[PDB]
């Protein structure tokens, strides 16, 4: 539930009405006219919005706000192009970087994480264990072998026996 | 217009100026063009089918004629494989027998079964 001010929001338009257009206010290739603008351009940045203030108001405030922001935007970016204005530090955060680094990128990493650990349940990893269980069901005496010996005593059954039971689903064939 | 494909595009152009296509490489380099890299003045009319006559086009040798060059290449290809084939008739014979192996030709060592002894095994 952030805040705004109404009378400041009217006085800002009263301030802007006497100002030159954005296509003129910076095309003079200092501080007589360029010093009022370097504060007004920071009125774009100063972040008076309101979280719950957008919900609980009428459109009379909304149109007034929207026209004021649409002029402060030009006074910021035109002065950024020709010339706070007269500084240089990096990097001035943009408009898209909040919901591409903090919603797009972590969901897009979470997608990689889920794809890696969903690959654990695979048909090869299940078919190997099912084939070993099918060996140990018919011939459970190789369970009595030691733990190191069983991995070579299953393979002699696999190589030896068929153990596939595909021709038993095809009883119409023979 | 020199090549047979440049001639075959005369009825398409209607307002195109139809200039003479000349390679960008065979221009001299010592004239100071706008583009020293590609040998081309700033507003110079490009040819019908330019990108065979670009600097980035093929190398386009200029010493031999291409027809002659074809004859010389196939001439070397012929004089190698003809001489090396005729020289197989003038070969001398060997002084040794091929060597021999035990165990009925090592049929069992390189695979094999008693019925299958023909495919595997050498020089009993």
């Amino acid at each position: 539930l952030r805040a705004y001010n109404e009378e400041k929001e009217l006085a800002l338009k009263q301030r802007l009405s006497q100002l030159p257009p954005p296509g003129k206010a910076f095309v003079t290739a200092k501080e007589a006219e360029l010093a009022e603008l370097a504060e007004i351009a920071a009125l774009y940045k100063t972040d008076r919005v309101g979280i719950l203030d957008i919900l609980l108001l009428g459109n009379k405030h909304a149109r007034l706000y929207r026209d004021n922001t649409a002029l402060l935007k030009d006074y910021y970016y035109n002065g950024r192009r020709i010339l706070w204005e007269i500084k240089r530090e990096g990097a001035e955060k943009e408009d898209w970087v909040n919901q591409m680094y903090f919603l797009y990128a972590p969901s897009l990493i979470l997608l990689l994480i889920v794809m890696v650990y969903k690959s654990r349940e695979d048909i090869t990893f299940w078919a190997k264990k099912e084939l070993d269980q099918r060996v140990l069901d018919k011939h459970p005496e190789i369970n009595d072998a030691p733990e190191n010996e069983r991995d070579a005593l299953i393979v002699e059954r696999i190589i030896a026996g068929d153990y596939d039971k595909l021709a038993s689903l095809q009883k119409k064939a023979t | 217009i020199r090549a047979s494909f440049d001639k075959a595009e005369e009825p398409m152009l209607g307002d195109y100026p139809d200039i003479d296509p000349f390679p960008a490489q065979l221009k001299n380099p010592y004239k100071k063009y706008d583009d020293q890299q590609d040998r081309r003045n700033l507003e110079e009319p490009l040819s019908v089918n330019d990108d065979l006559y670009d600097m980035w086009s093929p190398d386009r040798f200029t010493h031999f004629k291409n027809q002659d060059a074809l004859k010389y290449f196939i001439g070397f290809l012929t004089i190698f494989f003809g001489a090396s084939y005729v020289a197989t008739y003038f070969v001398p014979e060997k002084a040794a027998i091929p060597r021999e192996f035990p165990y009925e030709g090592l049929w069992k060592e390189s695979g094999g079964t008693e019925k299958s002894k023909a495919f595997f095994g050498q020089r009993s």
Binding site: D162, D164, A167, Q170, A173, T174 | -
Partner: protein
């Protein structure tokens, strides 16, 4: 099976029909026009229509009957060859070769598309859903066109597809059995 066609008889019938069509079209062209015209300019300022209606009508049915006789069957291909001949007649009015080749290819393809569907502007009464057995089959019946079954016989699919690619007269696993 079939019966061969009288090429000369069908061609001279179509020649008479093309004659009558050329006459009625020249009579239509006189009256649906402007400027000074009389009885004699029926065939003077005719636009050359009676040659169109005559030549197309001869060439189509002559090529059609000839193609149906030398192939000894009737399908949509005969309409393709006959429409190619019709495009040859209609292409010669514009005395240019790539035009002519285009007329012969495209009119022949359009007439072949007409012939393949049944060579009819209307429908066939029988052999369509409202008047043909459709739905599932009831017993081990020969599955006709328009019908569905659940499992085709393997001896039928080996006759239709072949004995090559992956399809075989015995499935591959019971072909490799322990006894």
């Amino acid at each position: 099976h079939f019966h061969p066609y009288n090429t000369l008889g069908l061609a001279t019938q179509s020649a008479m029909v093309g004659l009558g069509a050329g006459v009625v079209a020249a009579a239509a062209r006189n009256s649906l026009a402007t400027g000074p015209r009389n009885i004699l300019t029926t065939f003077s300022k005719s636009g050359g229509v009676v040659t169109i209606f005559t030549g197309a009508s001869i060439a189509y049915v002559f090529t059609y009957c000839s193609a149906a006789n030398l192939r000894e069957r009737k399908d949509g291909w005969n309409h393709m060859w006959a429409g190619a001949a019709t495009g040859a007649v209609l292409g010669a009015r514009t005395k240019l070769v790539p035009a002519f080749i285009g007329w012969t290819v495209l009119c022949g393809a359009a007439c072949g598309l007409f012939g393949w569907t049944g060579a009819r502007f209307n429908a066939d009464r029988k052999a369509s859903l409202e008047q043909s057995p459709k739905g599932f089959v009831q017993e081990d019946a020969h599955q006709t066109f328009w019908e569905v079954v659940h499992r085709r016989p393997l001896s039928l699919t080996v006759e239709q597809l072949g004995e090559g690619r992956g399809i075989n007269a015995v499935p591959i696993a019971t072909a490799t059995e322990a006894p």
